């Protein structure tokens, strides 16, 4: 995260770190949506242009974390994956349309002060909250600029109007994406960066005071560049697929 701040303890108890087993390293962000299901970006797992294709046994999920590098004894929990599910119409070839994946854990994680699931939106919350100018929150252990943070970073960013999103890029934007960030003359700054991919964009509903994950960090050209915006997978638009997987698995 660029131009973010250190998270508070327990501020994002749904944050998940996707961790490469060998060599050990951050791969991506992710989110906890139940005691056995983890949500991430498809490109974190499958991106043939970069020879990326991970299988279950390649990875660990680390939940409850704050420090990036440290092993947080008696706090984080580390989980193995039972099965990865990538959207069947994920478009890695062109623009990362439908950039979404689920991971099924081998065993349920115990919830704690530091470990708790986020909600996924219903149609009515999505309609109410996904509006230009409304702010969400992005969290992650990725780059601080286009070093790496000691602890989880947080930044609040406004949703941008669809024509501004489209006019900022040569990439074809779809209905399964939205973009967020400040415009050059808004003063404030901030963005996701490498390593933050697959983590959540969340919003706090003013109707029931619960946090909802509206987006998944998906792609951006550079990090925190003026006139550019970060793109996020639109979680509500892909909810049928999520439900079908959880229902069928």
């Amino acid at each position: 995260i660029v131009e973010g701040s250190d998270a508070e303890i327990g501020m994002s108890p749904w944050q998940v770190m996707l961790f490469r087993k060998s060599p050990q390293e951050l791969l991506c962000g992710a989110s906890l949506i139940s005691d056995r299901w983890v949500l991430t970006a498809a490109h974190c797992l499958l991106y043939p242009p970069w020879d990326k294709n991970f299988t279950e046994n390649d990875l660990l999920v680390r939940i409850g974390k704050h420090s990036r590098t440290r092993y947080e004894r008696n706090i984080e929990k580390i989980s193995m994956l039972e099965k990865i599910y990538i959207h069947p119409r994920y478009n890695w070839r062109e623009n990362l349309d439908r950039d979404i994946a689920l991971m099924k854990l081998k065993k349920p994680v115990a919830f704690s002060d530091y470990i708790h699931p986020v909600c996924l939106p219903d149609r009515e919350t999505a309609a109410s909250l996904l509006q230009a100018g409304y702010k969400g929150r992005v969290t992650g252990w990725g780059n601080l600029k286009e070093g790496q943070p000691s602890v989880l970073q947080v930044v609040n960013l406004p949703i941008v109007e669809r024509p501004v999103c489209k006019d900022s890029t040569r990439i074809r934007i779809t209905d399964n994406m939205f973009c967020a960030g400040y415009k050059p003359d808004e003063g404030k700054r901030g963005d996701a960066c490498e390593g933050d991919s697959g983590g959540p964009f969340v919003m706090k509903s003013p109707f029931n005071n619960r946090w909802y994950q509206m987006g998944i960090v998906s792609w951006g050209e550079g990090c925190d560049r003026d006139g550019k915006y970060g793109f996020y997978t639109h979680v509500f638009r892909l909810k049928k697929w999520i439900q079908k997987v959880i229902d069928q698995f």
């Binding site: 961790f19 050990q24 390293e25 951050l26 660990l60 590098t69 440290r70 092993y71 580390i78 193995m80 790496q148």
Partner: peptide, 9 residues
């Protein structure tokens, strides 16, 4: 950079 994770994982 990453601290050692318990062998059991």
């Amino acid at each position: 950079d990453f601290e050692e994770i318990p062998e059991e994982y």
